[PDB]
Every structure is written in structure tokens, then in C-alpha cells.
Design an enzyme around this catalytic site. Structure first.
Site, PDB file in Angstrom:
ATOM      1  N   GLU B  66      -5.529  -1.554   6.608  1.00  0.00           N
ATOM      2  CA  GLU B  66      -5.164  -1.214   4.691  1.00  0.00           C
ATOM      3  C   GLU B  66      -3.506  -1.570   4.706  1.00  0.00           C
ATOM      4  O   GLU B  66      -3.300  -2.594   3.997  1.00  0.00           O
ATOM      5  CB  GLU B  66      -5.378  -0.610   4.266  1.00  0.00           C
ATOM      6  CG  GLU B  66      -6.987  -0.619   3.612  1.00  0.00           C
ATOM      7  CD  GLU B  66      -8.052   0.790   2.958  1.00  0.00           C
ATOM      8  OE1 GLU B  66      -6.689   1.176   2.978  1.00  0.00           O
ATOM      9  OE2 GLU B  66      -8.976   0.825   2.678  1.00  0.00           O
ATOM     10  N   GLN B  67      -2.664  -0.987   5.264  1.00  0.00           N
ATOM     11  CA  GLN B  67      -1.429  -1.663   5.077  1.00  0.00           C
ATOM     12  C   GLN B  67      -0.833  -3.382   5.637  1.00  0.00           C
ATOM     13  O   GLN B  67       0.028  -3.761   5.299  1.00  0.00           O
ATOM     14  CB  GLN B  67      -0.281  -0.600   5.546  1.00  0.00           C
ATOM     15  CG  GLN B  67       1.062  -0.852   4.947  1.00  0.00           C
ATOM     16  CD  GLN B  67       1.601  -0.753   3.614  1.00  0.00           C
ATOM     17  OE1 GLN B  67       1.123  -0.089   3.200  1.00  0.00           O
ATOM     18  NE2 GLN B  67       2.525  -1.360   3.040  1.00  0.00           N
ATOM     19  N   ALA B  88       6.343  -2.349   2.072  1.00  0.00           N
ATOM     20  CA  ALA B  88       6.768  -1.676   3.730  1.00  0.00           C
ATOM     21  C   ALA B  88       6.080  -2.182   4.628  1.00  0.00           C
ATOM     22  O   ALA B  88       4.631  -2.568   4.844  1.00  0.00           O
ATOM     23  CB  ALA B  88       5.988   0.071   3.394  1.00  0.00           C
ATOM     24  N   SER B  93       5.120   2.788   6.032  1.00  0.00           N
ATOM     25  CA  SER B  93       5.068   3.508   4.601  1.00  0.00           C
ATOM     26  C   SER B  93       4.592   4.251   4.148  1.00  0.00           C
ATOM     27  O   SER B  93       3.235   5.121   5.245  1.00  0.00           O
ATOM     28  CB  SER B  93       3.399   2.170   3.750  1.00  0.00           C
ATOM     29  OG  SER B  93       3.449   2.411   2.786  1.00  0.00           O
ATOM     30  N   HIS B  95       2.503   5.955   1.928  1.00  0.00           N
ATOM     31  CA  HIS B  95       1.033   5.468   1.176  1.00  0.00           C
ATOM     32  C   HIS B  95       0.257   5.956   2.728  1.00  0.00           C
ATOM     33  O   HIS B  95      -0.510   6.316   2.600  1.00  0.00           O
ATOM     34  CB  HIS B  95       1.138   4.062   0.924  1.00  0.00           C
ATOM     35  CG  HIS B  95       1.583   4.029  -0.463  1.00  0.00           C
ATOM     36  ND1 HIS B  95       1.176   4.599  -1.207  1.00  0.00           N
ATOM     37  CD2 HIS B  95       2.372   3.013  -0.605  1.00  0.00           C
ATOM     38  CE1 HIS B  95       1.606   3.558  -2.272  1.00  0.00           C
ATOM     39  NE2 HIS B  95       2.826   3.350  -2.170  1.00  0.00           N
ATOM     40  N   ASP B 102       1.660   5.149  -7.035  1.00  0.00           N
ATOM     41  CA  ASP B 102       1.561   3.602  -7.192  1.00  0.00           C
ATOM     42  C   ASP B 102       1.462   3.760  -8.852  1.00  0.00           C
ATOM     43  O   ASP B 102      -0.151   4.372  -9.050  1.00  0.00           O
ATOM     44  CB  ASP B 102       1.543   2.481  -6.618  1.00  0.00           C
ATOM     45  CG  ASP B 102       2.593   2.443  -5.288  1.00  0.00           C
ATOM     46  OD1 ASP B 102       3.421   2.444  -5.090  1.00  0.00           O
ATOM     47  OD2 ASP B 102       2.155   0.905  -4.676  1.00  0.00           O
ATOM     48  N   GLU B 153      11.598   0.064  -7.745  1.00  0.00           N
ATOM     49  CA  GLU B 153      10.587   0.376  -7.943  1.00  0.00           C
ATOM     50  C   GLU B 153       9.724   1.189  -8.532  1.00  0.00           C
ATOM     51  O   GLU B 153       9.852   2.237  -8.325  1.00  0.00           O
ATOM     52  CB  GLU B 153       9.016   0.267  -6.310  1.00  0.00           C
ATOM     53  CG  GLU B 153       9.634  -0.737  -5.200  1.00  0.00           C
ATOM     54  CD  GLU B 153       8.751  -0.781  -4.122  1.00  0.00           C
ATOM     55  OE1 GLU B 153       8.132   0.092  -4.015  1.00  0.00           O
ATOM     56  OE2 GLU B 153       8.636  -1.896  -2.891  1.00  0.00           O
ATOM     57  N   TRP B 155       7.914   1.523 -10.719  1.00  0.00           N
ATOM     58  CA  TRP B 155       6.262   2.289 -10.128  1.00  0.00           C
ATOM     59  C   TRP B 155       5.552   3.569  -9.049  1.00  0.00           C
ATOM     60  O   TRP B 155       5.166   3.772  -9.297  1.00  0.00           O
ATOM     61  CB  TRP B 155       5.285   1.566 -10.346  1.00  0.00           C
ATOM     62  CG  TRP B 155       5.472   0.303  -9.131  1.00  0.00           C
ATOM     63  CD1 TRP B 155       4.804   0.582  -7.778  1.00  0.00           C
ATOM     64  CD2 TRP B 155       6.367  -0.888  -8.929  1.00  0.00           C
ATOM     65  NE1 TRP B 155       5.287   0.184  -6.951  1.00  0.00           N
ATOM     66  CE2 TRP B 155       6.593  -1.315  -7.277  1.00  0.00           C
ATOM     67  CE3 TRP B 155       7.167  -1.683  -9.567  1.00  0.00           C
ATOM     68  CZ2 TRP B 155       7.265  -2.396  -7.172  1.00  0.00           C
ATOM     69  CZ3 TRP B 155       7.507  -2.378  -8.862  1.00  0.00           C
ATOM     70  CH2 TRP B 155       7.905  -2.671  -8.133  1.00  0.00           C
ATOM     71  N   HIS B 156       7.047   3.048  -8.304  1.00  0.00           N
ATOM     72  CA  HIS B 156       6.153   4.294  -6.605  1.00  0.00           C
ATOM     73  C   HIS B 156       7.529   5.410  -6.871  1.00  0.00           C
ATOM     74  O   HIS B 156       8.527   5.705  -6.591  1.00  0.00           O
ATOM     75  CB  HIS B 156       6.602   3.090  -5.434  1.00  0.00           C
ATOM     76  CG  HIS B 156       6.880   3.843  -4.159  1.00  0.00           C
ATOM     77  ND1 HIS B 156       5.527   3.389  -3.232  1.00  0.00           N
ATOM     78  CD2 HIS B 156       7.139   5.231  -3.304  1.00  0.00           C
ATOM     79  CE1 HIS B 156       5.180   3.571  -2.653  1.00  0.00           C
ATOM     80  NE2 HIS B 156       5.994   5.255  -2.350  1.00  0.00           N
TER      81      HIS B 156
HETATM   82 CL   LIG Z   1       4.307  -0.449   0.870  1.00  0.00          CL
HETATM   83 ZN   LIG Z   2       3.785   2.370  -3.556  1.00  0.00          ZN
END
Ligand SMILES: [Cl-]
Ligand SMILES: [Zn+2]
Ligand SMILES: [Cl-]
Ligand SMILES: [Cl-]
Ligand SMILES: [Cl-]
Ligand SMILES: [Cl-]
Ligand SMILES: [Cl-]
Ligand SMILES: [Zn+2]
Lengths: 189, 189
Positions: B66-67, B88, B93, B95, B102, B153, B155-156
Site C-alpha cells: 500500500e505504501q 516516505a 514509512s 506507518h 495521521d 507535517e 498532522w503526523h
Molecule cells: Cl509516509
Molecule cells: Zn503519516
């Protein structure tokens, strides 16, 4: 990739089934992934209906592991009755093959997590008039719960492609009934 | 299961990395998954700040596939330079380990999935006053781009747990700088 694959409690996915190819789908406020042909037709549908500002993609591809975490969460929070109604068993969800979309309304807020709102709405009505022209069917219609084993889900659409989606929608069939029909037909030959 | 694991362009995930334990995380408008301790602390934080109706989890766990697809999408839609600023590299990442979130605002429509809006809001300001008390840090602060290799960022957020999140936040550090500090401090002994 058979766009007609029947996946339900009686027809679980095989463990050795190859993951679908995926692409990130447009028209959502978060990352949602779908099989590429599905994402393309979703995008074509939203553009053609002018529904960009009114609807959004809520859910797409989900792994078996994720489906199991969703099932377990709903079981714990909402109980078995609700969970059996609206959440497919892990291994039995068409979300796992990237051919299913859950769609919701945009100005709609306070949503149910498992049952996004897609009802009582001019945008939804327009969507329901055109989605079959882009390969989508309403997967779990209101009076078919005995056939599908899932309750009415006005937000959940399955990609089968053309002309299948038009044939199924015009006859008010489920995918289960479509398979029965094709089986009954081939024998005639 | 080190909650302090440094994952970035210079420190990608092992190929042999255990995939994380996962649970569904509350306070989103769609299904998001996180490591169980992260989901627990996220929930405690949202309840403590009373932000249940004001903020939402936009993204959580993301598979490596998915990344890649997210990266590929951003390349096509936003171009290479923008993509490198905000997304990333696949395999790099946080994630992918279920320790990153996020976060966005709840009353937003047409929010950006790459850069969710999370500034200039009472809800965001309150979140920024309390998140470190529940184990979270702002992963990519402004004017740390040369250190993190990622642009600002707001939001992260990254889960590192306590007291690390309080230590990092009070010093206005990045996780990179935290790692250098721990290493330099170990040498004093
Ligand atoms: Cl990312
Ligand atoms: Zn993120
Ligand atoms: Cl893929
Ligand atoms: Cl997974
Ligand atoms: Cl489901
Ligand atoms: Cl580094
Ligand atoms: Cl788990
Ligand atoms: Zn669905």
C-alpha cells in the site's frame, strides 16, 4: 482476475489465492486501494454523475488480517448480532479481493463506522441510477438477506463489470442469483 | 517490539521484520488499524481532551504494498519533488509498523489524504498540548527537514511511549536526535 468471483460464507476465499493488484483510488479523504479496473470505473462514475462534492469512498481493499480485526472489534463493541449482520467473516469478504467499495455521503457526519450513511439523499439516488453503467451492483439488497446471508447495506457496492452489472441490476438479482442463473443456463446447452 | 525503532530513508524496515500486532482503532470515519498499545493511548488521549467530535484518525497501519501504491499515486498526481517532501519511500514509512497516525479535523470535507489539514484550529492546538502525555510525538517538525529528510507535517504523530514522548517534545527534538542523544549518553558510562 475473475470479476464475477462469488465470495460469501459458503464460498470463502482460498488461502493460496493471489492478492489482487492494487492502486490508490481517487475521491476519498484517506488512502483507499482497489483493483485497478475498479478504481478506473469508480473514477469514471463519480465524474460522469458530477458527484465529486457529494459522495466519498469510505472503504476498499482490506486484508484477511484486517477483516479479522474489524470483526473482532465489532464483536466486542456491538455484539454478535450486529456483527453477523454487517461484517463478513474473515476470508469471506469481497473487500479482500479489492472488488468492493463502501460509499458514504460527504456533508453527512456522525457516521456509523461499519455502516456508512448512504440513504435518504439525492446524491445517493443519482448514484443508484448510474452505478450499474460502470460495472457496479448493489451487493446486499433489502429483501435478499436469506440469499446473501448479509443484511441490507445501501453503502456497499461490488464491481462485476459490464454487461453483468446491468443484467444483475435490471433483474434485481444478487450475485448469488446471477450465479444460479448462469448455472441453470449452461445446462440448457 | 521496540516502540523507539528508527525508521526512515537511512534506516528502512528489515525484510525480516515481524509484522505488528494490530487492533481496529476508534475515532475515525473508516477502518484504521494500529498496534494495540498505540490504539489504547490514542483513545485515552482523544477522551482526555474531549476531542471525540472534533478530530479523526485519517491513516494508521499501511502494508508495504500500500505504501508503494500511495507513493506511485502521489508521483502521478503531485510530481516527484512534492512526493519526496511528504511521502516516505516504500519500506521506509513508520506507518508500516503501526506506530504512526495521521490526524485530521472531523468537519472537513475534501480533505487531502497526503497532507490532512491540522493547523489553525482549537482542536489541533489542544491536541498539541496533550499528545506527549499519551506517548506521541510530532514526527516531522518545521525546521527539522535536514535532520528527518521529510518536510513539516503538522498532522503526523509517532507513538514512542512514555516518558520518551515527554522528553522528546520538551527538548523540541526529532526521533533522530533522540537516538543520537541516547547513543552519546550511553558512551558517558
Ligand atoms: Cl509516509
Ligand atoms: Zn503519516
Ligand atoms: Cl499491489
Ligand atoms: Cl495486514
Ligand atoms: Cl465486511
Ligand atoms: Cl538518519
Ligand atoms: Cl494481532
Ligand atoms: Zn463493504
Amino acid at each position: 482476475m475473475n470479476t464475477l468471483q462469488l465470495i460469501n460464507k459458503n464460498h470463502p476465499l482460498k488461502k493460496n489465492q493471489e492478492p489482487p493488484h492494487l492502486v490508490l483510488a481517487p475521491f476519498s479523504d484517506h488512502d483507499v486501494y482497489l483493483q485497478p479496473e475498479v478504481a478506473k470505473q469508480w473514477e469514471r462514475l463519480v465524474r460522469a454523475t458530477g458527484l465529486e462534492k457529494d459522495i466519498r469512498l469510505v472503504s476498499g481493499y482490506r486484508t484477511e488480517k484486517e477483516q479479522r480485526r474489524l470483526w473482532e472489534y465489532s464483536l466486542k463493541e456491538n455484539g454478535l448480532a450486529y456483527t453477523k449482520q454487517f461484517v463478513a467473516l474473515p476470508g469471506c469478504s469481497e473487500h479482500q479481493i479489492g472488488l468492493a467499495i463502501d460509499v458514504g455521503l460527504k456533508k453527512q457526519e456522525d457516521d456509523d463506522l461499519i455502516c456508512p450513511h448512504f440513504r435518504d439523499s439525492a446524491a445517493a439516488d443519482l448514484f443508484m441510477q448510474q452505478m450499474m453503467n460502470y460495472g457496479f451492483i448493489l451487493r446486499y439488497p433489502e429483501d435478499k438477506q436469506e440469499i446473501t446471508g448479509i443484511s441490507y447495506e445501501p453503502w456497499h457496492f461490488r464491481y462485476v463489470g459490464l454487461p453483468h452489472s446491468q443484467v444483475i441490476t435490471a433483474q434485481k438479482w444478487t450475485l448469488e442469483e446471477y450465479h444460479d442463473y448462469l448455472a441453470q443456463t449452461v445446462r440448457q446447452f
